[PDB]
Amino acid sequence: GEVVPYKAGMQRGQGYNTYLQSLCVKDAVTIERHDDSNPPFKKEYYSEFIEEYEKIAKSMRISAGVNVDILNRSEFETSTLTYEVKVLVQHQVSVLDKHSFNKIQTTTPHATYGDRFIADFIKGGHFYARVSITAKNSSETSELKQSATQEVERAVSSIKRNASVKITIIESTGTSSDLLAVKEKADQFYKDADSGKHSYVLFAVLGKYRNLSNFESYFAPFDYQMASLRSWALFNDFTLYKAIETMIKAVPESKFKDGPERKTQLIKQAINIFETIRDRVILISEHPEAAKEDPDHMKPGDFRLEVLNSIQTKLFHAQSQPIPNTDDYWTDVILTTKGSGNQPLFTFPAFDFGDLIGTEVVSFGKKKNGEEYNCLIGERVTSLDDYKELSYFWVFPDSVQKFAMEMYGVSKVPTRNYMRVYAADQSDIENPRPYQRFWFYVPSANSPP
């Protein structure tokens, strides 16, 4: 605990609850700048100027000998210029400042002051440029034809058509011939740093209230290093529980098992237990010694299981299409519509809507311009043009505890797009067949409702 990423609203000289990573009382510490001078700084400058692809190819074809003449010319020019710089400036914290501690009013000084204060801000800067000057593609051409009666033919002529200047400039600085223009700003940035105008807040340096001279032990600051280490299993469960609030809200009503009165008490059940872990965290602020007690709240895994159990599913009954000129070899099409003469493989619950994290879609790509069978995970037809979604449905690419244990694997024959989807094994993954795209797990019906 010596640095922390900048968080907007930070005010120099304020408490910082290093465990909760929140912000605390402002102006507890007054820093007097005895000397007005920018701190020492460190500079970097990586620059590239890629070759000048200068290529002139020129033609001169003449033929004469009722006398005829031929005079043909050509001219091809190229010029690819590229540029790139990256300037990094990092300042330091001045060593000639005075730190003091001001007294505030709270019967709970621990929650007001916190643990550590923001002494000085680590400042810096950044630069990033790219110039892409495209070729000229000069195309000077010409033809002539003098037969004897007379004849002239000069209907051949063309000129350059190319000029691309792509410029990207990314800067983080402070207030006080395109290749060359970028260079001057890039070089001026180097020289500008020496003037010490590159004051952009990057990091904050933390200091302990004990080291303050003016601190006469207004309180006993906690040391959260061990408390944070012990209470890590709880911190992760916080992010997971917050994420699964959006699980319930995102999915619509028309795909809940119990119907109307399932959204609210699933939403309320998650938030009610979100309170239990949030107040446990707030309790650790008052009593870091309370980190010993084990959690007394339902696991995110068990509650997540409860979420998926109450979700309707689609019975994607894969069917083996029969194609002529095939013996003991079928064509597996995963379509929900019953077919005639197609052998059904298996009928299983599946997810026909997104908004359920941990799931990805397997959208078959059928050529509208042809008949090729494709199977792309998380890649719809919309990426390409004139293709058809035989079937799209989100699924779990990986297994889950006691829910998604049965397996499905995709295999394709390069010569002929006969979809070969079958119940694969951990060995099909270990030793993959040619053109085997992806494998996915589907929920097991053996789960108890």
Q: Which is nearer to a copy of itself, 156 or 384 (CB)?
A: 156
CB of 196 to a copy of itself, least distance (A): 4
Token pair belonging to 39: 């701190």
- H or E segment to which residue 116 belongs: strand 116-133
Query: Considering only residues 385-444, where is the footprint of a copy of itself by CB under 8 A?
Result: 427, 430-431
DSSP label of 433: P
Task: Quote the Cα angle for 4-278-270, to 5°.
Answer: 125
Among 18, 19, 119, 332, which residue sits at the site for a copy of itself (rule: CB under 8 A)?
A: 119
Please say which residue, 276 or 309, places its beta carbon nearer to a copy of itself. 276
Tokens of 73: 């010319």
Residue 116, beta-bridge partner list: 16, 208
User: Could you tell me where the DSSP H helices lie in 122-232?
Assistant: 178-194, 224-230
Smallest separation, CB 168 to a copy of itself (Å): 5
Rg of the chain over Cα atoms, rounded to whole angstroms, equals 35
Site string for a copy of itself, 216-255 (x = CB under 8 A): xx--------x--xx-xx-----------x---x------
Q: Which of 18, 99, 332, 342 binds a copy of itself (CB under 8 A)?
A: 99
| Least Cβ distance, residue 10 to a copy of itself (angstroms) | 6
Q: Identify the three-state secondary structure at position 174.
A: coil
**Which residues contact residue 272 at a Cβ distance below 8 angstroms, ignoring those fewer than 6 apart?**
none
HSE-up of residue 140 (Cα within 13 Å, Cβ side): 9
196 binding a copy of itself? (CB under 8 A): yes
Q: Pick one of 252, 257, 258, 264: the residue that binds a copy of itself (CB under 8 A).
A: 264
3-state secondary structure (DSSP) of residue 264: helix
Q: Per CB under 8 A, does 66 bind a copy of itself?
A: no
* Binding piece for a copy of itself, criterion CB under 8 A, among 159-167, 317-325, 372-380, 415-423: 159-167
Among 9, 414, 448, 449, binds a copy of itself (CB under 8 A): 9
For the chain, helix (H) and strand (E) counts, in that order, are: 7, 22
Tell me the closest approach of the beta carbon of residue 430 to a copy of itself, in angstroms.
Answer: 6
In b/e form, how buried is each residue of 148-157, taking b as 16+ CB within 10 angstroms?
Answer: eeeeeeeeee
The whole-angstrom separation of Cα 64 and Cα 62 is 7
User: In whole angstroms, how close is the CB of 327 to a copy of itself at the nearest point?
Assistant: 26
Pick one of 1, 4, 134, 405: the residue that binds a copy of itself (CB under 8 A): 134
Q: What is the distance between the alpha carbons of residues 327 and 418, in angstroms, rounded to a whole number? A: 13
394-395 vs 116-133, strand pairing mode: unpaired
- 269 contributes a contact to a copy of itself by CB under 8 A: no
Establish if 155 lies at the interface with a copy of itself (CB under 8 A).
yes
* Residue 288 is a binding residue for a copy of itself (CB under 8 A): no
| 52 versus 329: smaller Cβ distance to a copy of itself | 52
Does 285 interact with a copy of itself (rule: CB under 8 A)? no
Q: Which is nearer to a copy of itself, 227 or 356 (CB)?
A: 227
Q: Which stretch binds a copy of itself (CB under 8 A): 185-193, 318-326, 341-349, 374-382?
A: 185-193
Q: Is 355 in the site for a copy of itself (CB under 8 A)?
A: no
Of 172-180, 317-325, 369-377, 437-445, the window that binds a copy of itself (rule: CB under 8 A) is 172-180
Breaks (C-N over 2.5 A) in the chain follow: 65, 148, 176
Residue type, 210: R
